Ligand binder design. Structure first.
Ligand SMILES: [Zn+2]
Ligand SMILES: [Zn+2]
Ligand SMILES: [Zn+2]
Ligand SMILES: [Zn+2]
Lengths: 82, 79
DNA sequence: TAGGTCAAAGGTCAG
DNA sequence: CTGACCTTTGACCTA
């Protein structure tokens, strides 16, 4: 076995394990990182829900981090220091 | 009653290389000694070593382990 | 405990 | 931004 490991709970992409308390791909891992660390604010240009999947994840930064939160990502598991 | 880490004040999982320390400091210590490490303060021996600013300076985190008791004599060489 | 393991959290920088 | 790779740190297990 190999190719199957974990699946990212946010966009469906692959995932090596959990990241901020939730199974995530490197894409949602760093995305969540960048946002919390930066106090980033987003806005939906469609509605509340927008579909997040590996190929359509980057369009609505607003729905993506909200889904990052509705899946259980922990803002606290983020560290700022170097 | 538990105990505190002598080197960063975090919660301790008992004693490790001569002193009551938490897993962080303990691993940090063994690795440093073992896989020969040699870091240099990015500012000046000062760095306020605590739970939180634990990792910013490794010079001060390792040298704060030695002022504690933790010795090179406590672990076996990189095997 | 020592003493490993290996998740998870750190980082970089071509895309 | 982004996300594929790369290093260090520590929560945990066992003996
Ligand atoms: Zn993802
Ligand atoms: Zn949206
Ligand atoms: Zn400590
Ligand atoms: Zn220092």
């Amino acid at each position: 076995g190999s190719f199957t490991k974990h699946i990212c709970a946010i966009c469906g992409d692959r995932s090596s394990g959990k990241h901020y308390g939730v199974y995530s791909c490197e894409g949602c891992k760093g995305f969540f990182k960048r946002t919390v660390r930066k106090d980033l604010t987003y806005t939906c240009r469609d509605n509340k829900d927008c579909l997040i999947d590996k190929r359509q994840r980057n369009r609505c930064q607003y729905c993506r981090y909200q889904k990052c939160l509705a899946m259980g990502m922990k803002r606290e598991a983020v560290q700022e220091e170097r």
